[PDB]
Nucleic acid binder design. Structure first.
Ligand SMILES: [K+]
Ligand SMILES: [K+]
Ligand SMILES: [K+]
Ligand SMILES: [K+]
Ligand SMILES: [K+]
Ligand SMILES: [K+]
Ligand SMILES: [Mg+2]
Ligand SMILES: [Mg+2]
Ligand SMILES: [Mg+2]
Ligand SMILES: [Mg+2]
Ligand SMILES: [Mg+2]
Ligand SMILES: [Mg+2]
Ligand SMILES: [Mg+2]
Ligand SMILES: [Mg+2]
Ligand SMILES: [Mg+2]
Ligand SMILES: [Mg+2]
Ligand SMILES: [Mg+2]
Ligand SMILES: [Mg+2]
Ligand SMILES: [Mg+2]
Ligand SMILES: [Mg+2]
Ligand SMILES: [Mg+2]
Ligand SMILES: [Mg+2]
Ligand SMILES: [Mg+2]
Ligand SMILES: [Mg+2]
Ligand SMILES: [Mg+2]
Ligand SMILES: [Mg+2]
Ligand SMILES: [Mg+2]
Ligand SMILES: [Mg+2]
Ligand SMILES: [Mg+2]
Ligand SMILES: [Mg+2]
Ligand SMILES: [Mg+2]
Ligand SMILES: [Mg+2]
Ligand SMILES: [Mg+2]
Ligand SMILES: [Mg+2]
Ligand SMILES: [Mg+2]
Ligand SMILES: [Mg+2]
Ligand SMILES: [Mg+2]
Ligand SMILES: [Mg+2]
Ligand SMILES: [Mg+2]
Lengths: 85, 240, 77, 164, 202
RNA sequence: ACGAGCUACCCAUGAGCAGUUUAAAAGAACCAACUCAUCUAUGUGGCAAAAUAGUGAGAAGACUUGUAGGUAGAGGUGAAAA
RNA sequence: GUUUACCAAAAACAUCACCUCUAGCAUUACUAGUAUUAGAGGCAAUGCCUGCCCAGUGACACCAGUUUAACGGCCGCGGUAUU
RNA sequence: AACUAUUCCAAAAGUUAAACAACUCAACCACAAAGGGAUAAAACAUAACUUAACAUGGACUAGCAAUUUCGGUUGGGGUGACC
RNA sequence: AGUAAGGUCAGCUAAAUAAGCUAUCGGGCCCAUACCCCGAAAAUGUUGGUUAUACCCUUCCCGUACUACCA
């Protein structure tokens, strides 16, 4: 959420502008839970999955501040309890 | 406040059902369509558009029904006729010359040579002759009749190619449809509905039309006699 | 065909379950302990109500085939 | 010089090429790039192909040269016809030019039965002859070479060492 | 994902304190959008040989969309993690020590697939006597089928051929997979004449 | 933020129109209840922040009317009088 | 018939009629309808009529072009039959 | 600007892929064709096309609409004139 | 009143390279006239200034045109 200048000129009109991420519908597979979740994911999330070399690695390596999703924390907590138990 | 639509009945019944007018107000409560409201109270008759509907799935063969009476329907501009067969009754749109004590045949068997076209029979477009007048056109198999239901409106079949029928709508626009769709042969009743003359302003209020607004709007560029080529044929056949 | 139901008039379907119930081997945290709604807590799923003692007026109507005189043959009255 | 032909010169330069026979004994020409480069091997192979595809021993080798006769300056140079007699003429020959001006020339070199050394000597003379039209060093004049016989396909000659 | 920066400078706060944000600090400008960049490729390790990609235990930099949709979900490939690479590298050592790979290279597998369904036209000219030898047969692969065949790889049925007919040729790639391709010896024709007579007419 | 208990329009649910003239319950005709408010005179801090007296137009319809619900100010509503 | 409740009740608006324009169709308006239908407008019953003009503008076609019951337009100077 | 509608590009999803204009003038071959006098390379280092419903970023057109002003002197202002 | 604005052969137009059409004058064709063919003549409203002139400006004159409003 923010403002912008038309024509990228300072002396121009000030305009309210909202930028929204492009959402995609994908289903992901987790080895720890062996269940498929249809989760609204973004292209950045998929890149982070490949960067961590695994969907479970992405959840278990990224901290809370990086994830910013209650579903992710519950997904981590479900798998974290699975390993400990 | 959100309102509730009066279309809450779930089971089909031949008896008239209660009807509540809208007046152009949407569910929110604001005017969306002007010039509607303040009409005479009306009751709605449950009209069965799907001509071919067996009573039970045990015997899917063609069945023949009998016409009891032809009544006047306040909702639509045509005349509906009560039709009974087996253990149920149905309200279907009457053709030009349907009367009491008449027998109507409903069938779907696509025969190779032909089938004689009667004034009330409903046959699939694959069996009708080339030069046949039809109404209550079914756009897709099993969807039901949607097109050509106004008073006096009749479409004419044009040709059947590669197992597909092409018809002419009342708007003189060709339409392509699978030949297995059910259609009714004839012209819709109340032919002289177009020739009816309204004698006074009050009769418009009785029908349920409110007078137009008095604001004087200068004509824009949209006005004027426009000559435009006919749009291309609309086809509902999904080519694989 | 043209079914005579209307989406708005028909009873709405139950809301989708929360994501917590989809995670295997994870006990959800619900507000059923405080017996009142609270935002941020998962919606409980309760078993169908089973009154120990049947009440004549307030019980659900018995099925038609439960009647002793129910017969498969269709008789016309 | 038009940009349309500049793209074509870029495309032909971008075609992959590898040296030597790959590890696989049998492989598709689609999968692996051109391999045959040596002039001496190419001339012997054409004579070999005459044995493999039994025909007359005498064959006119109509060499195809993908000469870069453009991109000297922003304005293209015009085609010409330089005539120079080869040291081993076959039984002054004009250097024809493409009708479509697609930067390829088809000029006969010598007969198949001629020795490889003489044919290679004729090839070197042709390289100097075609470059005589634009001897400037600003831009390359030869891109690819394809030596084909009457009953054989061309081979990607490693013409880069023979340019000077 | 969009990337923006503020038009107006923000005053500093160097003691680990949150800086003051004003209304004029909300004015952003789009400097770059991540979706418009030329996207890269994804390297994956194949756990099963693909029809057009590499073989079991190979490194392929396939397109990013393909890996996420058909390769990884179906198990044909796994992530090319540094720990994952050495497992296949160690796995290769066991087979190649005793020559037990029998998997061919990335192109080698495609050679087997193409040769499984192919027919070679061995055009010979009857004006001069011709005898078929493995060197001659390999020539027709390059011209007709576009196949480069090593002279020793071909194993003819050892029967001399002097007339047109139908025969069979044995083709072996890397000494591991043996392919028996049909052989069709017909009268030779000039491709310029052949394509004019048949392709142009029909 | 709060307002459609006045008013503009609409959705529900109710309730009124006697006599007279005509094959007529015909947006016909005479005239009350009823509803509007043409003309003039009183009134002008008045009985009244728009009324009283006389006189008028419609009065089986595009008519009056009770209860209750809906549309809210960058709008609602309007047989356009901004 | 309707309107400026509280200075204008009218020649204003509406109206039957005629005409132009936009749309081939499903679960909350239009509509539980389907071009003899439904919207966005003009002009005002009936009767006799509604002439000429696509250059400009607008719209359509989205190219040539086509449209005025679309906005709008619909001429000078000089001489000539005794006067 | 937002918003509604039209159109394009990008993102996204999917589909297919290894390619054609001789003519024998001599002359071999019983044919069908052949040889001498050309039978290359290449397709594109990916390319091409399709994509319903939703929907992101960047542009184009139109509708609707937003912000803000409308100079001065003048034998009172406007008009003419002047600075 | 103010402002705007024009004058060109007898007539009407286009250019300032003063042209084109018609009218007028002479001749031919026809029984005669007209049509038609051929040939000739003809002007920049006015004064002054525009290197010098003309299309320009200025003066004079004729005539054309708009506006003259709030109380
Ligand atoms: K009707
Ligand atoms: K209310
Ligand atoms: K009072
Ligand atoms: K009145
Ligand atoms: K026009
Ligand atoms: K004064
Ligand atoms: Mg209706
Ligand atoms: Mg109207
Ligand atoms: Mg009007
Ligand atoms: Mg400090
Ligand atoms: Mg109220
Ligand atoms: Mg009465
Ligand atoms: Mg009356
Ligand atoms: Mg009133
Ligand atoms: Mg009174
Ligand atoms: Mg009075
Ligand atoms: Mg009196
Ligand atoms: Mg009266
Ligand atoms: Mg009256
Ligand atoms: Mg409110
Ligand atoms: Mg408003
Ligand atoms: Mg009103
Ligand atoms: Mg007005
Ligand atoms: Mg006004
Ligand atoms: Mg009146
Ligand atoms: Mg008033
Ligand atoms: Mg009054
Ligand atoms: Mg008429
Ligand atoms: Mg009239
Ligand atoms: Mg009027
Ligand atoms: Mg009038
Ligand atoms: Mg007219
Ligand atoms: Mg035009
Ligand atoms: Mg955008
Ligand atoms: Mg501002
Ligand atoms: Mg001013
Ligand atoms: Mg002033
Ligand atoms: Mg003054
Ligand atoms: Mg002025």
């Amino acid at each position: 959420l923010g403002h912008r200048y038309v024509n990228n000129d300072k002396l121009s009109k000030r305009v309210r502008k909202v930028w929204k991420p492009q959402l995609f519908q994908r289903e992901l597979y987790s080895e720890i839970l062996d269940k498929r979740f249809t989760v609204t994911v973004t292209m950045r999330t998929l890149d982070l999955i490949d960067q961590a070399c695994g969907f479970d690695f992405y959840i278990l390596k990224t901290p809370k501040e990086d994830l910013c999703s209650k579903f992710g924390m519950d997904l981590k907590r479900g798998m974290l309890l699975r390993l400990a138990r | 406040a959100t309102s509730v639509s009066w279309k809450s009945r779930t089971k089909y019944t031949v008896m008239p059902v209660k009807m509540r007018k809208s007046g152009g107000r949407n569910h929110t409560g604001q005017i969306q369509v002007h010039g509607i409201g303040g009409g005479h109270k009306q009751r709605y008759r449950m009209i069965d558009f799907l001509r071919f509907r067996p009573e039970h799935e045990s015997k899917p063969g063609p069945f023949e029904e009998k016409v009891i009476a032809v009544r006047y329907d306040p909702c639509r501009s045509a005349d509906i006729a009560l039709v009974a067969g087996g253990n149920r009754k149905r309200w279907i749109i009457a053709t030009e010359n349907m009367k009491a004590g008449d027998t109507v045949l409903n069938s779907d068997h696509i025969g190779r040579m032909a089938v004689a076209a009667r004034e009330g029979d409903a046959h699939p477009l694959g069996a009708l002759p080339v030069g046949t007048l039809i109404n209550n056109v079914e756009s897709e198999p099993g969807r039901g009749a949607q097109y050509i239901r106004a008073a006096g409106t009749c479409g004419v079949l044009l040709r059947k190619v590669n197992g597909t029928a092409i018809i002419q709508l009342p708007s003189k626009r060709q339409m392509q449809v699978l030949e297995t769709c059910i259609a009714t042969v004839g012209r819709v009743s109340n032919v002289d509905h177009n020739k009816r003359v309204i004698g006074k302003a009050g009769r418009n209020r009785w029908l349920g039309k409110r007078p137009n607004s008095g604001l004087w709007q200068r004509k824009g560029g949209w006005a004027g006699r426009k000559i435009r080529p006919l749009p291309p044929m609309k086809s509902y056949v999904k080519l694989p | 065909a043209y079914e005579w139901g209307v989406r708005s008039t028909r009873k709405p379907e139950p809301p989708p379950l929360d994501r917590v119930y989809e995670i295997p081997g994870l006990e959800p945290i619900t507000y059923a302990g405080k017996m009142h709604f609270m935002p941020g807590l998962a919606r409980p799923v309760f078993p169908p109500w089973d009154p120990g003692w049947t009440h004549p007026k307030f019980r659900r109507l018995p099925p038609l085939h439960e009647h002793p005189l129910y017969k498969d043959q269709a008789c016309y009255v | 010089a038009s940009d349309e032909k500049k793209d074509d010169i870029e495309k032909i330069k971008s075609y992959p090429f590898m040296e030597g026979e790959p590890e696989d004994d049998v492989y598709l020409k689609r999968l692996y790039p051109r391999q045959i480069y040596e002039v001496e091997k190419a001339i012997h192979l054409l004579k070999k192909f005459q044995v493999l595809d039994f025909t007359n021993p005498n064959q006119g080798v109509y060499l195809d040269l993908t000469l870069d006769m453009t991109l000297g300056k922003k304005k293209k140079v015009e085609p010409f016809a330089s005539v120079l007699s080869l040291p081993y003429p076959f039984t002054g020959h004009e250097i024809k030019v493409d009708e479509e001006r697609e930067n390829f020339l088809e000029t006969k070199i010598a007969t198949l039965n001629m020795s490889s050394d003489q044919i290679a000597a004729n090839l070197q003379a042709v390289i100097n002859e075609v470059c005589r039209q634009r001897p400037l060093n600003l831009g390359p004049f030869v891109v690819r070479a394809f030596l084909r016989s009457s009953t054989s396909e061309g081979l990607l000659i490693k013409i880069e060492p023979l340019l000077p | 994902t969009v990337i923006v920066e503020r038009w107006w400078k923000v005053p500093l706060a160097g003691e680990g304190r949150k800086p003051r944000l004003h209304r004029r600090h909300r004015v952003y400008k789009l400097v770059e959008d991540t979706k418009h960049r030329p996207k890269d490729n994804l390297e994956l390790v194949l756990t099963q040989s693909v029809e057009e990609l590499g073989v079991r235990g190979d490194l392929v930099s396939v397109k990013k969309s393909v890996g996420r949709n058909r390769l990884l979900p179906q198990g044909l490939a796994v992530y090319a993690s540094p720990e994952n690479k050495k497992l296949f590298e160690e796995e290769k050592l066991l087979r190649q020590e005793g020559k037990l790979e029998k998997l061919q290279t990335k192109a080698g597998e495609a050679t087997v697939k193409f040769l499984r369904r192919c027919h070679l036209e061995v055009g010979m000219k009857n004006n001069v006597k011709w005898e078929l030898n493995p060197e001659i047969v390999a020539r027709h692969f390059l011209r007709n089928l576009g196949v480069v065949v090593a002279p020793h790889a071909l194993k003819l049925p050892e029967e001399p051929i002097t007339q047109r007919g139908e025969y069979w040729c044995e083709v072996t790639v890397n000494g591991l997979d043996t392919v028996r391709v049909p052989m069709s010896v017909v009268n030779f024709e000039r491709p310029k004449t052949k394509r004019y007579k048949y392709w142009l007419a029909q």
